[PDB]
Amino acid sequence: VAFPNQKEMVRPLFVFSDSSITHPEFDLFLRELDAEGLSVMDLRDVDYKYHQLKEMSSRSLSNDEVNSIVKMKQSLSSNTGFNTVLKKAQLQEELEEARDAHDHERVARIEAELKSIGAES
């Protein structure tokens, strides 16, 4: 984002407040736009944004989109008990595959990884 008077800034989402914009805030924004020499968004563009938000909020996600969002949050997932159990089970399956294939090098790494992940309370 960017203030008109100030410069560009990268901000996270939680900084924004759910409270509505007050009259002096919008007036100060208009004064900053006039100082920089900019204009306000057109009413046609305002309606286009409103329709875009309503369509996006009322949209129905597809299976592929839902799986992509789930994979994205799984990449963001630091830890979750169900997911840790599933990962440990998958690692155990990979370990038995490596043991049955007589691969003495992979199995040590999988055992070390399981030891690091494990030791619950």
Binding site: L13, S17, I21, V46
Partner: peptide
């Protein structure tokens, strides 16, 4: 081409909960 009023901006309020 008309300027946007306060109510027009209020129609497109997108809260932090809505962002999440």
């Amino acid at each position: 081409s008309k300027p946007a009023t306060l109510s027009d901006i209020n129609k497109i309020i997108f809260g932090r909960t809505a962002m999440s």
